[model samples]
Target: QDKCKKVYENYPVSKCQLANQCNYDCKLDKHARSGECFYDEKRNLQCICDYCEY
Candidate 1:
């Protein structure tokens, strides 16, 4: 997001868990979903997309 000033604005962000949000969006790949989004230990909101890993 270095070159992208309004990175968060152009994204649909989420912090859902492994057993929740994935919901086959990753085509049954566990790692792909895990790497996509997750809930931090601190419960912080994590968001990601194909181009950006947040």
Candidate 2:
């Protein structure tokens, strides 16, 4: 089998009013392989996931 390692990116802002947007984008909308949200050094929200399959 082959995999895409992992894909991630940093979003300058969050779309949601309160909750972080990262979780929703990666875990809900996209249905990534495995996803999670985290805060960067500057306190930015990001959604990272491993979405590789065949």
Candidate 3:
């Protein structure tokens, strides 16, 4: 079975306006397998990265 690890990173830019951008940033910059944008209770946009734990 494949396992994944979840990590969080602050959006590089002002706001995480687009999911694609955030995903691309995490993959390229953080070397994550996948990524998405998520907003916390405070409405702060962050990048949720998924990495293969193997």
Candidate 4:
């Protein structure tokens, strides 16, 4: 069996409005497994990229 882990990273463009757009940008530009828009520490909407590491 192989071990897999999920990793998260903040996208360079933190000011995100739409989750769909964020997901598209992250996958296209960063090659991430998935992406979403969420609030950050400063209470600002941002794009977070998720990756699968094995």
Q: Could you say which candidate leads in lDDT? A: 3
lDDT of each: 0.36, 0.52, 0.65, 0.58
Model 1 Cα displacement at 46 (Å)?
2.5
**Weakest 10 consecutive residues of candidate 3 by summed lDDT:** 1-10
Ranking by lDDT: 3, 4, 2, 1
Better by lDDT, candidate 3 or 2: 3
For residues 1-54, could you state the per-residue lDDT of candidate 3 as single tens digits? 454735564446566676776577668777887677766688766677767622
Candidate 3 ranges beyond 4 A from true positions = 1-8, 52-54
> What tens-digit string does per-residue lDDT give for candidate 1 at 1-54?
463111122224544555344433432333332233543578554433223333
Error of 3 at 45 (Å): 2.2
Model 2 TM-score relative to the real fold: 0.34
Clash totals in order: 0, 0, 0, 0
C-alpha TM-score for every candidate: 0.24, 0.34, 0.53, 0.53
Candidate that beats the other on lDDT, 1 or 4, i.e. the better one: 4
Compose the digit string of candidate 4's lDDT tens values, residues 1-54: 252222235455545666676676667667776677766478766666656521
Regions more than 4 Å wrong, model 2: 1-7, 10-32, 51-54
Model 1 is weakest, by summed lDDT over 10 consecutive residues, at: 3-12
What is candidate 2's CA lDDT for residue 9?
55
Q: Supply candidate 1's per-residue lDDT for 8.
A: 22
- Best first by TM-score, ranked: 3, 4, 2, 1
Lowest summed lDDT over 10 consecutive residues: which window, candidate 2? 13-22
